[PDB]
Symmetry: C2
Subunit: 125 residues, 2 copies
Amino acid sequence: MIEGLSHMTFIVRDLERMTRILEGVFDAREVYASDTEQFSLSREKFFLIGDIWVAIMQGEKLAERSYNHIAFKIDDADFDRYAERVGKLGLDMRPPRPGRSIYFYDDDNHMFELHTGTLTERLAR
Amino acid sequence: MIEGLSHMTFIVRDLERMTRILEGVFDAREVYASREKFFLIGDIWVAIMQGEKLAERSYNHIAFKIDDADFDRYAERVGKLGLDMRPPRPREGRSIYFYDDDNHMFELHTGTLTERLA
Ligand SMILES: [Mn+2]
Ligand SMILES: [Mn+2]
């Protein structure tokens, strides 16, 4: 049996900028940096978004953008606030459709989504 | 405030094969049916939509938590499907890494963040 999600891992060109994205958009909390170690060549950081473990490692960006995406849940009341946060970070986004979502990209062609709706709502529609 | 994970969406060339992988490896259950399908892995909403496979493989990955006592079983599930799988490192704090048919890397992992932080 699958107990739940363990972690999601993203490879990014610039660990510092990705840190600012995860902190700026999701209020991610940095819990680990391999840079606190002596002679570790590879560079990684671990973050928590609530109880979600996100790991980032420095490497190459995704070649192309695609519609593979990871979506986090927010409340409908915070939709404009979150669109603002994405704005202040200077991130590319998909246009807001006329549940609702904000889709944006980090600096390495990963797509993320902030979605106000639920599965139950989605299936009933 | 982020309330939690909403869903994860994968683009795949063949929804029937992806269905078999999700059900076969993760015990995913289908709740909605070129087009999209929806699954739950426990309370994790997964959406799959027909389209183009990732040009390239990378080490970006999604990892699911399993118990160490189930490790051999899960490795046999991935193998039974003919999925491209990294031979498990003889070990704990263990992982199984595999690609589906569309260059998405997945991981089954027996350890926790807390343990890893040690
Ligand atoms: Mn989505
Ligand atoms: Mn991993």
